[PDB]
Design a protein around this ligand. Structure first.
Ligand SMILES: O=c1ccn([C@H]2C[C@H](O)[C@@H](COP(=O)(O)NP(=O)(O)OP(=O)(O)O)O2)c(=O)[nH]1
Ligand SMILES: [Cl-]
Ligand SMILES: [Cl-]
Ligand SMILES: [Cl-]
Ligand SMILES: [Cl-]
Ligand SMILES: [Mg+2]
Ligand SMILES: [Mg+2]
Ligand SMILES: [Mg+2]
Ligand code: NA
Length: 334
DNA sequence: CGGCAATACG
DNA sequence: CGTA
DNA sequence: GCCG
């Protein structure tokens, strides 16, 4: 089993679901406490189990697996012997974990804000709603639409939203393309949002696109919220983090939609980064830097010795530049 | 210990 | 601070 | 928390 997640296929569904889920609780809790190193290790150990070809049924099978030390192995030992891990269960039940999970899952709220609120004594969504003047516009939107944003996004929602975005993008710029990215590109059946990457075959024509797209969506009454970021080789892409009004039979629900626009020259890097998973990209970038001495981000791949950027016409190019066997998106579910 | 992905945007 |  |  190789050490980096980008060196091994990791499918969406696998043979150690229970064990990985327990380790991911501990990762999540580590994050709430500001222990980013511990979070990373628990995430990696969970991912190692996702990549295994069959179920772990005995402690000996952890021998030699990367990222399994005393702590992670104990967790798996307890699950194997008793069906539960007391540490995991204590985390689950704790007021601190449940409140941080509640707060951090609000759009516009991160660990530091959730922690401050917790320390201030706040515990519920209604507690936050009673102090509106303190909230950012993004947080106000996240709270306003919290129930809907907590509802899993389904493939049928994706299909509908893709048609809407394709229509608006096609109205805003002839020849522009829309590519589904994020978790649904990796084969996920449900998600927290829908992510789309937009480009145009003639380099430069994609500039100045999202205000036109957003105007056209607003004119259809589809936009409940959005936050636009202008673009800057480009080292920042134009982006819009949106909440769409999605029609449902006799009603509607709010859905988070992210739009990002890249020049076609950088499209493969953007697609790679935005397709994830988050752990897959952290691992891939770590591998690039530490093993190959190349610096990878959403915009490109830089050789610091030669001081040159790699051109890429595909994700396959990028894996080749890094000396990695190609993994399709469905196997990037680290 | 030194590291842990990435980073301009607002 | 928070965003992908 | 794990790695080197
Ligand atoms: O911290 C991050 C967040 C996201 N990303 C990349 C990978 C992720 O798959 C992609 C889309 O971000 P989302 O927050 O939309 N996650 P994803 O689409 O994978 O799952 P979901 O939207 O269902 O939570 O952006 C990172 O690289 N680092
Ligand atoms: Cl830590
Ligand atoms: Cl899924
Ligand atoms: Cl981006
Ligand atoms: Cl590609
Ligand atoms: Mg997503
Ligand atoms: Mg997203
Ligand atoms: Mg230390
Ligand atoms: Na959040």
């Amino acid at each position: 089993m190789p050490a980096y997640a980008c060196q091994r296929p990791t499918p969406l569904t696998h043979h150690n679901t229970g064990l990985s889920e327990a380790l991911e609780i501990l990762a999540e809790a580590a994050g709430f406490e500001g222990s980013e190193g511990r979070l990373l290790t628990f995430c990696r150990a969970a991912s190692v189990l996702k990549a295994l070809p069959s179920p772990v049924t005995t402690l000996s099978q952890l021998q030699g697996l990367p990222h399994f030390g005393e702590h992670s192995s104990r967790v798996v030992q307890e699950l194997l012997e008793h069906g539960v891990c007391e540490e995991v269960e204590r985390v689950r039940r704790s007021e601190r974990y449940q409140t941080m999970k509640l707060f951090t899952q609000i759009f516009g709220v991160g660990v530091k804000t959730a922690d401050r609120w917790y320390r201030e004594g706040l515990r519920t969504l209604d507690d936050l709603r009673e102090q509106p003047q303190k909230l950012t516009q993004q947080q106000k939107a996240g709270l306003q639409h919290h129930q809907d944003l907590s509802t899993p996004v389904l493939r049928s929602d994706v299909d509908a939203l893709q048609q809407v975005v394709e229509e608006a993008v096609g109205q805003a710029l002839p020849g522009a393309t829309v590519t589904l990215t994020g978790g649904f590109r990796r084969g996920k059946l449900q998600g927290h949002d829908v992510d789309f990457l937009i480009t145009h075959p003639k380099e430069g024509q994609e500039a100045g696109l999202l205000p036109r797209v957003m105007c056209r969506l607003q004119d259809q009454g589809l936009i409940l919220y959005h936050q636009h970021q202008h673009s800057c080789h480009m080292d920042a892409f134009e982006r819009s983090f949106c909440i769409f009004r999605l029609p449902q039979p006799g009603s509607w629900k709010a859905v988070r939609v992210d739009l990002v626009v890249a020049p076609v020259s950088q499209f493969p890097f953007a697609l790679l980064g935005w397709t994830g998973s988050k752990l897959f990209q952290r691992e891939l970038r770590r591998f690039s830097r530490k093993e190959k001495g190349l610096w990878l981000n959403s915009h490109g791949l830089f050789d610091p010795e030669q001081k040159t950027f790699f051109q890429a016409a595909s994700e396959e190019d990028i894996f080749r530049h890094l000396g990695l066997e190609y993994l399709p998106p469905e196997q990037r579910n680290a």
